[PDB]
Amino acid sequence: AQYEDGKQYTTLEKPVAGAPQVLEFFSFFCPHCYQFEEVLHISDNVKKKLPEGVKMTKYHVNFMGGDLGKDLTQAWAVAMALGVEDKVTVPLFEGVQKTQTIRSASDIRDVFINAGIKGEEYDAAWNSFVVKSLVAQQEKAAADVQLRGVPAMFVNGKYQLNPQGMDTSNMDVFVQQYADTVKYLSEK
Numbered sequence: 001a002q003y004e005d006g007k008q009y010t011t012l013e014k015p016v017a018g019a020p021q022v023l024e025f026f027s028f029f030c031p032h033c034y035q036f037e038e039v040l041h042i043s044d045n046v047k048k049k050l051p052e053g054v055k056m057t058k059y060h061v062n063f064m065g066g067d068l069g070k071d072l073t074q075a076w077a078v079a080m081a082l083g084v085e086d087k088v089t090v091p092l093f094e095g096v097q098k099t100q101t102i103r104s105a106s107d108i109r110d111v112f113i114n115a116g117i118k119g120e121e122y123d124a125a126w127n128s129f130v131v132k133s134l135v136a137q138q139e140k141a142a143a144d145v146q147l148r149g150v151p152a153m154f155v156n157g158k159y160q161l162n163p164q165g166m167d168t169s170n171m172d173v174f175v176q177q178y179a180d181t182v183k184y185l186s187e188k
Contacts, residue, residue, distance in 0.1 A: 003184050019154065022050065023059070027063075030064060032151050037093055041175070051187070065096075068103070073135055074135055075088075078111075080134055081130055096107075109122060144159075155188075
């Protein structure tokens with residue numbers, strides 16, 4: 001066939017019921033994730049090709065960057081709760097990987113302040129139980145699928161994107177293949 005299990009995707013042995021339709025995992029410490037976000041705009045091109053009625057979820061993971069990695073999962077929970085993902089994603093990536101000016105939770109906080117979220121508002125979110133459960137959700141979703149690597153995308157808790165099995169000669173063609181695969185799996 002044109003799309004083959006073990007080629008553009010793998011199938012989970014252990015399917016995850018009640019899973020978000022399109023579930024993406026990343027780390028601000030993850031170098032291909034940086035590419036996926038700022039050079040390839042994967043999430044965005046997937047959304048563009050996805051049918052309607054489909055929600056996309058994106059979660060941060062703990063297994064990279066030790067203590068700062070965990071702070072970043074909590075900060076992403078704050079981002080999701082305040083709905084400011086599109087304002088902090090790029091500066092968090094560049095602060096961690098490009099400029100290396102993120103070294104502590106206070107530095108993560110500075111990125112939000114500079115993006116215009118208020119101190120009070122950020123610190124209140126940071127400490128809120130709503131953020132606690134949001135962090136739990138990120139962890140549970142990663143735990144559900146045995147996740148030891150990012151970037152990663154899962155469709156309907158049963159299929160996992162396999163970018164290694166796509167051509168990377170051309171970044172544009174790579175992105176479309178990736179997105180067409182998500183759409184194919186979506187319709188499955």
